[PDB]
């Protein structure tokens, strides 16, 4: 299946905390991915014979910035790919990946940003999750903060991950308080707030843009993991999430037969559909990724082993596991990313190394 065809290491020797292929690449352009670590983001092109061609980095003016995360979208007018980055300074930067110019930046969290995700249908809706316990939804077309997901009934410690579902109607977040929380964004209130965000132009009005303050998740559980929950992804109506306890759990809110859209905020049950165990992944901030079609799931561990689960089976617990090791790959893997066509898998490590695996 996958063979390791190349690796390299970036000059800073600090952890690479994230990697993302650009799935908005144009037809016939080469496959491109971004790595984030130290105070930089770097872009690379994949070519034949395993070649990983260095392009150009964005390096923050602050030597104390530490980028943790990035996410791709495109300009909704021009179609050109854009790259969002954020980390310990709690500043989101929107980067033109061609020139690596910082086009604009957003401050709110003031506090470390642990993850960024873009809405699956609307390239302007960017979600950030913070060390300050909140999530925020931004509209990067009109430069507005649409809503803050917080309150004492929100997370009570750093939020580490979040994911929108397929249509972008709800978000599942998770973090250091051991919980997973659901926030619906297709409520009348949230749909109106999005609509109003698009109508906002500070040059044609006197008002500040009002953000929603969302203080009540639509569902919450602490019954999946018993430690920091550091990665979550929807799989249709089910959830995949992990902690630092050497398992990915496949679960859903409520009882086995309960529709996700009839779950009420007081729902006190969850249903466990399976659990994928693996070894030596006790440190936290270790993210799995899926391929475009959500046929598979890849995770690295803290000693440089990859696990890949084939989810193309009739029930989540029947997933088929493949492992990939290389004798020289021994550092902690923080994140993986598949190319859009699934032909390439990249893993990035705590020693600033980058590993390329082709089918």
């Amino acid at each position: 299946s996958f063979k390791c065809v190349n690796s390299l290491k970036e000059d800073h020797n600090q952890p690479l905390f994230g990697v993302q292929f650009n799935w908005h690449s144009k037809e016939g352009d080469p496959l491109v991915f971004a790595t984030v670590g130290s105070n930089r983001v770097t872009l690379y092109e994949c070519h034949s014979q395993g070649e990983i061609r260095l392009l150009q980095s964005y390096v923050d003016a602050d030597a104390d910035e530490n980028f943790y995360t990035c996410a791709w979208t495109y300009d909704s007018n021009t179609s050109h790919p854009l790259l969002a980055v954020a980390g310990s300074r709690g500043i989101i930067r929107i980067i033109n990946p061609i020139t690596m110019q910082c086009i604009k930046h957003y401050v709110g969290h003031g506090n470390a940003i642990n993850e960024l995700k873009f809405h699956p249908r609307d390239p302007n809706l960017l979600l950030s999750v913070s060390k300050d316990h909140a999530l925020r939804l931004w509209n990067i077309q009109t430069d507005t903060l649409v809503a803050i997901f917080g309150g004492v009934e929100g997370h009570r410690d750093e939020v580490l991950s979040a994911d929108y579902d397929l249509l972008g109607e709800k978000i599942m977040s998770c973090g250091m308080d051991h919980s997973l929380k659901l926030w619906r964004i297709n409520s009348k209130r949230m749909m109106n707030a999005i609509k109003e965000s698009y109508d906002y132009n500070p040059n044609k009005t006197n008002r500040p843009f009002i953000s929603q303050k969302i203080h009540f998740p639509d569902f919450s559980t602490r019954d999946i993991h018993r430690n920091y929950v550091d990665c979550v992804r929807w799989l249709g109506d089910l959830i995949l999430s992990k902690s630092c306890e050497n398992a990915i759990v496949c679960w859903k809110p409520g009882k086995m037969e309960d529709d996700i859209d009839k779950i009420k905020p007081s729902e006190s049950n969850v249903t466990i559909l399976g659990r994928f165990d693996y070894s030596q992944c006790d440190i936290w901030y270790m993210r799995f990724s899926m391929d475009f079609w959500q046929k598979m799931l890849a995770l690295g561990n803290q000693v440089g082993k990859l696990y890949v689960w084939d989810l193309e089976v009739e029930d989540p617990h029947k997933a088929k596991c493949t492992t990939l090791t290389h004798h020289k790959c021994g550092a902690a893997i923080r994140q993986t990313s598949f190319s859009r066509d699934s032909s390439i898998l990249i893993a990035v490590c705590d020693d600033a190394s980058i590993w390329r695996w082709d089918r």
Partner: peptide, 6 residues
């Protein structure tokens, strides 16, 4: 639990 191996 730590973030990075010691």
């Amino acid at each position: 639990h730590r973030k990075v191996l010691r």
